[PDB]
Design a protein around this ligand. Structure first.
Ligand SMILES: Nc1ncnc2c1ncn2[C@@H]1O[C@H](COP(=O)(O)OP(=O)(O)O)[C@@H](O)[C@H]1O
Ligand SMILES: [Mg+2]
Lengths: 94, 528, 176, 94
């Protein structure tokens, strides 16, 4: 449904942790919002100065870790999808 | 502080002395031949009054034990004024008569609690007989007669009040204010007028009167301030091509919005007027909704989901004509569906039954009058302020009596109604459970003669001879103290509201009955 | 209390009445008496002010499925939340009424819990672990009838089981 | 009517939703303004440093998603239209 442009990447911010290794239940208010999420759509790549495309380091399906000051929420079908540039993803988990 | 305690007769004589002092001052104003009482004001200009409640409220005694008797009788008139607005002198006279007659039986060793129970039993019987004797006040001639009697034999006041009620109907509101001339004048305001003027003199379309007349205009109801033009433009354009004027009722129209309306007025592109929304707080919202219902429109507000930019002609109210003066506008006739208007009036009158503040139903009744009635203003004319205040009190008293007349009916005046009710109650088998209760009944039977006795005493005749002759008669037969002649009270025009007579008797009995049961009195001791 | 007539009169109030009126006249469903009668409504207990729409919309949508009316008992319903209710009321999409939460301070919390126990619901609040966005129909209280007047509402009968109601009564009388 | 220059894109921001899935009517004041809109006019492309034009990732007709910070409203013949650079459009819907 959503197709990002250039370096943009669409991520669904995964929900906060609920049960711990000891089973302690944390209320949703107390639970800190994780900086991780899976990627649903990926852009073609940033157009560098000579044309063509920059190869992307994120492929659709993996879990990526992104900055908590970056990204913009999109109101599409009520999901908490976040759209952000390719450079704001600090790292890729597994 | 330290308290002084009085017992038995020593307490009762102090209490009765306070009753007599207050009632004697109020006595002087009773009846057509009653005279005025002057009360000195701190700020000068003493008030000249013939009202019993006005005289009673200003009486305070140095003796604190006599003051209790005055204070307790004082609030007989206060309650009668609250519930009827008339008959405060009659209530005070009745209360003194019960105390005077009841103290004889208390001094005779009779149980005062059974006297109070007998007094309540007799008053209940007499009030029921008053209901049977009462006749409805249907004709406007009776309204003039009731107003004339309550205005101390002033036919001009009675006639102007009868005209006012005819013009505004039963649902209308009549007020009394000072006049500039020497004669009473009646001003009737029809339709809806909310006493708010225009925001700019350029809205005037005819300089002869300095008024802004809009013929078949649209009415825009807005509950928020209007300052910018980009929001008023979409609705102004819709008004523009229709050709009808636009009346903007909002909290305020300043800045670009006000300038645009003024600019189009001079250039003649679009005729319009802007007025401030009447009322403050939630009352402003209430009448704004009433205007929308009356004008067949909807108040534009983001609190309901409507927006000024999305406002259409259908959302705007309509009227046949509206005129905006310097300080008021009148909507001659709203375009709303009368069924919705009647439903709105029904809702407000339901709220009237639940109103808890004096200004609450007073403004609620004003809203009803604006919707499905009229507002009449009686400007009292007098040469001086002291005469103006005395005349205004008489007009207000006559207004209260005429309102009580349509509410509950009329009875023969001059104390005849209480005498006729007493005879009917006695003939119906009024009796107590014990001789002390029988004496309490006899207290009320003698007490109800007092209003006629004091009316006759003020007229200079012999009260006992006149009372005996009146009791010999039947029906509306009575004594006219103004002319000193016997005859039919109804035919002679001496009419009383049965609500005023019933309220005066019930209030007097409740307080004077309690005064008979007093054996000990406690007051602050004098400062040596 | 003082009476208006000359005769003594006895007025008996049954069920839960917390002497708080509606926040908008448009909640009235019958103009004959100026009251807001809700038949078999859901009751939403909230201990915090409600102003935005994005949080109350998830629960307002759930009560629209069953079509039963919704009674919102919260500290205040203003702005978008109050607006959204009146737009739905006039259009007839979903009938609802909103009242202020009765009582001040901790007494407001205690009586709010009593209403939840009586109505068989739960007080939605972040202090216990419930969010208005995640509130479901099961968390909402129920009653067979409630009427909202200008200055009071009466819950005719809560839907909670008598066992929990009796236990709550026992706790209060112990605290007495 | 309006022809953008270089990397400029003209979009008509779509109306904020009035009904819901169950039909609940949101008042216009309460309804949040969506960050989406369809494109009416598209530029030739940003002139990169070596000359020529950058091919544009949006063509006239698609529905695009843009940040709320970016864009400017234009007053021509009454309609509200948002003119903004190509980089602010972070995604294209369908
Ligand atoms: N011409 C009259 N003849 C006989 N009685 C009258 C006449 N005019 C008024 N009255 C009686 O006098 C009473 C009016 O008393 P008033 O001085 O107005 O004090 P209040 O209004 O407090 O009773 C009424 O009960 C009325 O019946
Ligand atoms: Mg009088």
């Amino acid at each position: 449904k959503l197709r990002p442009l250039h370096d943009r990447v669409v991520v669904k911010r995964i929900e906060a942790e609920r049960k711990t290794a000891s089973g302690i239940v944390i209320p949703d208010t107390a639970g800190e919002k994780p900086d991780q999420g899976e990627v649903l759509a990926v852009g073609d790549g940033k157009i560098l100065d000579d044309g063509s495309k920059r190869p992307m380091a994120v492929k659709v399906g993996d879990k990526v870790l992104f900055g908590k000051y970056a990204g913009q929420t999109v109101k599409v079908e009520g999901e908490e999808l976040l759209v952000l540039r390719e450079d704001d993803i600090m790292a890729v988990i597994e | 502080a330290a308290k002084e305690v009085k017992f038995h007769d020593s307490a009762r004589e102090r209490l009765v002395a306070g009753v007599n002092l207050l009632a004697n001052a109020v006595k002087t104003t009773l009846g057509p031949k009653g005279r005025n009482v002057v009360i000195e004001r701190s700020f000068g200009a003493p008030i000249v009054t013939k009202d019993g409640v006005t005289v009673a409220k200003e009486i305070e005694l140095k003796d604190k034990f006599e003051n209790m008797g005055a204070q307790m009788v004082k609030e007989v008139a206060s309650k009668t004024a609250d519930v009827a607005g008339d008959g405060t002198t009659t209530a005070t006279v009745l209360a003194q008569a019960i105390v005077r007659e009841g103290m004889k039986y208390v001094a005779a060793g009779m149980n005062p609690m059974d006297l109070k129970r007998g007094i309540d039993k007799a008053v209940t019987a007499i009030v029921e007989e008053l209901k049977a004797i009462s006749k409805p006040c249907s004709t406007t001639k009776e309204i003039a007669q009731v107003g004339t009697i309550s205005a101390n034999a002033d036919s001009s006041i009675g006639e102007i009040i009868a005209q006012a009620m005819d013009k505004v109907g039963k649902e209308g509101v009549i007020t009394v204010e000072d006049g500039k001339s020497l004669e009473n004048e009646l001003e009737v305001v029809e339709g809806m007028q909310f006493d708010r003027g225009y925001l700019s003199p350029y809205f005037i379309n005819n300089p002869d009167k300095q008024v802004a007349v809009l013929d078949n205009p649209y009415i825009l109801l807005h509950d928020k301030k209007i300052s910018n033009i980009r929001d008023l433009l979409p609705v102004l354009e819709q008004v523009a091509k229709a050709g009808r004027p636009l009346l903007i009722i909002a909290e305020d129209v300043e800045g670009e919005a006000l300038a645009t309306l003024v600019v189009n007025n001079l250039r003649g592109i679009l005729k319009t007027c802007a007025v401030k929304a009447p009322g403050f707080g939630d009352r402003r919202k209430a009448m704004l909704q009433d205007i929308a219902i009356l004008t067949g429109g909807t108040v534009i507000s983001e609190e309901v989901g409507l927006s000024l930019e999305k406002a259409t002609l259908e959302d705007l109210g309509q009227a046949k004509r509206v005129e905006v003066a310097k300080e008021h506008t009148t909507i001659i006739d709203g375009a709303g569906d009368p069924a919705k208007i009647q439903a709105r009036v029904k809702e407000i009158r339901v709220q009237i039954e639940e109103a808890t503040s004096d200004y609450d139903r007073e403004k609620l009744q004003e809203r009803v009058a604006k919707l499905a009635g009229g507002v009449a203003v009686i400007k009292v004319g007098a040469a001086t302020e002291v005469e103006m205040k005395e005349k205004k009190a008489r007009v207000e008293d006559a207004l209260h009596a005429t309102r009580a007349a349509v509410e509950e009916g009329i009875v023969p005046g001059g104390g005849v109604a209480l005498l006729r009710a007493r005879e009917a109650a006695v003939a119906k088998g009024l009796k107590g459970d014990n001789p002390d209760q029988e004496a309490g009944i006899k207290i009320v039977l003698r007490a109800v003669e007092q209003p006629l006795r004091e009316i006759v005493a003020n007229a200079g005749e012999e009260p006992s001879v006149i009372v005996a002759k009146v009791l010999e008669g039947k029906g509306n037969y009575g004594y006219n103290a103004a002319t000193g002649e016997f005859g039919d009270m109804i035919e002679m025009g001496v009419l009383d509201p049965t609500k005023v007579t019933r309220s005066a008797l019930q209030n007097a009995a409740s307080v004077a009955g309690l005064m008979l049961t007093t054996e000990c009195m406690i007051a602050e001791a004098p400062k040596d």
